[PDB]
Amino acid sequence: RSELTIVPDFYPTMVRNFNPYLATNLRTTTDFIYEPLVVFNEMKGNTPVFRLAESYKMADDLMSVTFDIRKGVKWSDGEAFTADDVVYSFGLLKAKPELDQRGINKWVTSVEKVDEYKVRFRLSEANSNVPYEISLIPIVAEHVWKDVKDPTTFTNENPVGTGPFTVIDTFTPQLYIQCRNPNYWDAANLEVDCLRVPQIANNDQLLGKIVNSELDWTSSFVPDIDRTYAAANPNHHYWYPAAGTQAFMVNFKNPDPAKKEALDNVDFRRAFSMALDRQTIIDIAFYGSGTVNDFASGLGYAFEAWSDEATHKKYKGFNTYDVEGSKKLLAKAGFKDVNGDGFVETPSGKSFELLIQSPNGWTDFNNTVQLAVEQLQEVGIKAKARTPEFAVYNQAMLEGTYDVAYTNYFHGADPFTYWNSGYNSALQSGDGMPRFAMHYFTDKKLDGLLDSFYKTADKNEQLAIAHGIQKIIAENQVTIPVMSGAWMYQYNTTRFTGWWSEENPKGRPSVWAGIPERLLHVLDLKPV
Numbered sequence: 113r114s115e116l117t118i119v120p121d122f123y124p125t126m127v128r129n130f131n132p133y134l135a136t137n138l139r140t141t142t143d144f145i146y147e148p149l150v151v152f153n154e155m156k157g158n159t160p161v162f163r164l165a166e167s168y169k170m171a172d173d174l175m176s177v178t179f180d181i182r183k184g185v186k187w188s189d190g191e192a193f194t195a196d197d198v199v200y201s202f203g204l205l206k207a208k209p210e211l212d213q214r215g216i217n218k219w220v221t222s223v224e225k226v227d228e229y230k231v232r233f234r235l236s237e238a239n240s241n242v243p244y245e246i247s248l249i250p251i252v253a254e255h256v257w258k259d260v261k262d263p264t265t266f267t268n269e270n271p272v273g274t275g276p277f278t279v280i281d282t283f284t285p286q287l288y289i290q291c292r293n294p295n296y297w298d299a300a301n302l303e304v305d306c307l308r309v310p311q312i313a314n315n316d317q318l319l320g321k322i323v324n325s326e327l328d329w330t331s332s333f334v335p336d337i338d339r340t341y342a343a344a345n346p347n348h349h350y351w352y353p354a355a356g357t358q359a360f361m362v363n364f365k366n367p368d369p370a371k372k373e374a375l376d377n378v379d380f381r382r383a384f385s386m387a388l389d390r391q392t393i394i395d396i397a398f399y400g401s402g403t404v405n406d407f408a409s410g411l412g413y414a415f416e417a418w419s420d421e422a423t424h425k426k427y428k429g430f431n432t433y434d435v436e437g438s439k440k441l442l443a444k445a446g447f448k449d450v451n452g453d454g455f456v457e458t459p460s461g462k463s464f465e466l467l468i469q470s471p472n473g474w475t476d477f478n479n480t481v482q483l484a485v486e487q488l489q490e491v492g493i494k495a496k497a498r499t500p501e502f503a504v505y506n507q508a509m510l511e512g513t514y515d516v517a518y519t520n521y522f523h524g525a526d527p528f529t530y531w532n533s534g535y536n537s538a539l540q541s542g543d544g545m546p547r548f549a550m551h552y553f554t555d556k557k558l559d560g561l562l563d564s565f566y567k568t569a570d571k572n573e574q575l576a577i578a579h580g581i582q583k584i585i586a587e588n589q590v591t592i593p594v595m596s597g598a599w600m601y602q603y604n605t606t607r608f609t610g611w612w613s614e615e616n617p618k619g620r621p622s623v624w625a626g627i628p629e630r631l632l633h634v635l636d637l638k639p640v
Contacts, residue, residue, distance in 0.1 A: 114639035115289065115308040116608060118329040120623045120630075124313050125285045131268040132250035133211040139625040140290055140307055144634075145273035146250040149179055149198070150243070151628040154525040155353070155619045157417035158244065161632060163298075164193060164251070164274060170569045174238040177246070181229040185297040187253050188271075188278035193297075195231040199223050200254035202233075204263060211263055216249050240569040244525055248628065276302050276634065286311045301635050304608070328607055331600040331622040336399075347606040351613045351621055354403040354414035354596035356523030357530055360384075360468070360484065361591050365512050365552040370462035375515070378589055379445035382430040385592045386438035387491040388484060394595055397479040403596040406431040408586035410534070410593035415527045420579040427586045431593065438491040449492055456492035466495040469517035471502040477518050480594070484518070509547040520597065521548055531581050532562050535590065551591060558584040610636040 120139035130141045143151075149165035152158050160168075165179040185193040202223040205212040219242050221234045235242055253272050260266050271278055278293040291306035292299075310327075312318050318332045325345050334341050334350070342348050362381060366372040374380045394402040405412045408427035411419055429437070442448075446459025457463050468484060470477040481497045488495045495516070500508070508514040522529050533539065537559050539549040561580045568574055601621040603611040612621040612633055619629040 113305045114303070114607070115306045116304045116329060116634070116637060117308040117310060117327050118623050119310070119312055119318065119327060119332065120625055122312050122314055122318070124311075126283065126288050126309075126311050128269050128280075128283055128288075129267040130271040131263075131266055132252065133205070133213065133263065135213065138288075138309075140277070140309060141268075141271070142250050142625050143275065143628055143631045144277045144290060144307065145271050145275045146252060147273070147275040147631065148247050148249075148628055149181075149251070150247045151631055152244055152247055152525060153619045153629055153632070155414065155417075155617070155629075158526045160243075160247070163631070168243050170240060170243065174240055174567070174569060175235050176232055177235070177243050178226060178230060178232040179243075179246075181231065182297070183229055185274060186295040187255075188273050188293040188295050189253075189256075190295055191253065191255055191272075193253075193274050194228050195225045196228075197251055197254045198231045199225050200257065201251045202249070204252075204257065205249070208263060212249075214245065214248055216245055219245055239566045240574070241528070241566045276304075276631070277307050281306060298635070303639060304634055304637050307634075322602065325604060325606060327602075328604045329623045330602045331624050332602070333600060334602060337602075341602065345604075345606070347604050348602075349605060349611070349613065350602040352401055352403075352598035352601065353614075353617065353621070354405075354412055355599050356414075356521055356597045357405055357410050357412045357593055358402075358480075358518070358520045358595050358597065359405070359410060359591045359593040361509070361517050361519055361547075361551045363509075363512060363514055363516070363550075363552060366515060367513065368464070368515075370458050370464040371466065371515055373458040373460060373462065374447070374464055374466070377445060379441055380447060381589045381592060383438045383442040383445070383447070383491065384488065384493060385431050385589065386429075386434040386441065387487050387493065388592070388594065389433045389487055390594055391433070393480050393483055397476050397483060398595075398598075401598040401600075403598065405593040405595050407582075407593060408589050409582040410530065410585065410591060411527055411582060412530075412593070412596045414523070414596055418527050418575065418578045418582075420582055423579065423583045423586050427589065430589060435490060442492060447492070454492065455494040464494065466493065467498050467515045468495050469498050469500060469505050469508065469514050471505045472499040473502075477520075481518050506547050509550040510545060512550065512552060517547075518594075519547065523597075527578060527581075528562075528565050531585070532565070535581075535585060536562050553588065553590045555584055555588070605640075607640050608637045609640060610638045612636070 129137045132141050150160045152160050166182045168179040170177040221236045224232050226232050256272050276296050277290040279291040281291040282289040288309050289306050323344050362375045364376050366375050390404045406428050408431050447456040450457045468481045470481040485495045533548040537554045561577050599622050612618045620627050
C-alpha cells in the first residue's frame with residue numbers, strides 16, 4: 113500500500129465534509145472524488161485532456177455545446193456514470209444558485225439529455241470559453257443526491273465518486289486517508305493507492321514537518337527554502353513556475369502637462385522599462401520566488417505557448433535591464449537634464465517628478481517601488497515612492513490622478529483575463545470598475561480583437577487574434593511588465609517519482625483544490 117502525503121490546505125482540525133458545493137469543505141473532494149468531464153491543461157495552451165467525457169463540440173453559432181460521455185465509467189459504488197448525472201448536477205445548481213460557487217448559471221440556460229451518453233448545454237450568449245468554465249463544475253451522482261433533502265447542509269460523509277480516491281480509510285481529527293476508488297475507470301494508470309492527509313494548522317507546523325521530510329506533495333510558502341528545505345535532504349525539491357503578471361502602470365492622461373509629456377511618450381516608457389532590474393526585484397523583494405517578465409505585451413512565461421516569438425524578440429530589449437540603452441533612448445527622445453540637477457527634464461524642457469504608488473501595508477510591492485526608484489534614479493528619472501491606503505491608491509487610478517502605480521493582475525487559464533481586464537478600453541469607465549485597465553491608453557483595433565477572442569471556437573483563428581493583441585500592446589509598450597508570480601509547489605522524491613518540474617514541465621504542479629491538473633499529476637506518480 114503506497115500512501116502519498118499531501119497538503120492541499122491547512123486546518124485546525126479535520127471535519128468530515130466532502131460536499132463539492134460548499135465553500136467550507138475538505139480540499140481533496142474536487143478532482144479526487146469527483147472527476148471532471150475534461151481537465152484543461154492551462155500551462156499548455158489550455159489544451160483539454162479528456163476524462164469522463166471523450167469529446168465536446170460547440171455549434172458553429174456557439175450558442176450551445178454537446179459533450180460525449182465516455183462509456184463504461186462507474187461510480188465507486190458500482191453504478192454507471194451517464195448523461196443523467198451531468199444533467200442532474202447542473203439542474204441542482206441552476207435551481208439552488210448558492211451551490212453554484214463558480215457562477216456557471218450565468219452561462220448555461222439549461223442542460224439537456226441528447227441520449228444516455230451525450231449531453232447538450234444551451235447557452236445565453238455566444239462564448240467559446242464556456243466549455244472551459246463547464247469543466248470546472250463538479251458532477252455528483254444523481255442516484256445518490258436525488259435523495260438528499262438538504263444539499264446546502266449535507267456533509268456527504270460517505271462520498272460516492274467517479275474520481276481515483278473515494279474510500280475514506282481513516283478519519284480522525286489529526287488525519288484522514290482517502291484510498292483508491294475500487295471501480296475507478298482509469299485504475300490502470302493510477303499507481304498511488306491512498307492520499308495521506310495530515311492535519312497542519314499553519315506555515316510554522318508545515319515548515320517543521322516538511323524539513324523533516326515527512327511530506328510528499330505541498331504548495332506552501334517555505335522561508336529560506338534553499339537552506340531550510342533543499343539542503344536538508346537531496347530528495348527535497350521544488351519548482352515555482354510563472355503565474356500572474358505584475359507591472360508598473362503609467363497614467364497616459366496625467367493632468368500635469370509635464371508629466372504627461374513623459375508618460376505619454378513611448379520612448380520614455382521604454383527607457384523607464386530598460387532601467388529596471390527585474391531579476392533583482394524578484395530576488396530581493398520576493399525572495400527569489402517569481403519569474404522575469406520581459407514581454408512588452410505582458411504575456412508572460414506562463415503562456416509562452418500563445419506567444420508570437422517574433423513580436424516578443426522585437427521588443428524584448430525594451431524590457432531587459434539595460435542602463436546605458438536607457439540613458440541613450442532618453443537622450444535621443446529629447447529628455448535632457450537642462451537644469452543640471454542630474455535629472456532629465458522633458459523635451460520641451462519642463463521639470464518633472466513621478467510619484468510611484470503601491471498600497472500601504474503590501475510589503476513586497478512597497479519594496480519593489482523603493483527599488484524601482486533607486487534604479488530609475490540611475491538613468492536620470494526623478495521618482496518618489498508613496499504608499500497610500502488601497503482605497504485611495506485604487507480611487508486615484510479610477511480617477512486618473514496618479515502618475516505611476518505598481519500592481520498585480522488576475523491570472524486566467526489563458527491570456528484573456530490579463531489582456532482584457534488590463535487593456536480593454538470599455539473597462540476604463542463606468543461605475544464600480546476595477547483599476548486594471550486604468551492606464552487610459554486607447555486603441556479601437558485592440559478592443560476589437562479582445563472582444564472577439566471568445567467569439568470563435570477555431571483555435572488557430574483565436575491564436576491569430578492572440579498574436580494580434582500581443583503586437584498592439586508590445587509596440588506601444590502600454591505598461592511596464594516586471595514579473596510573474598510563482599505557483600507554490602514542493603515535492604519529495606523519497607517515496608515517489610514522476611513529479612512534474614522545470615525538467616519535466618507537464619503542467620501546473622500545485623496540489624491545491626482549484627487546480628484540476630492535479631488529477632493528471634497524481635496519475636504520473638510512481639511509488640519508489
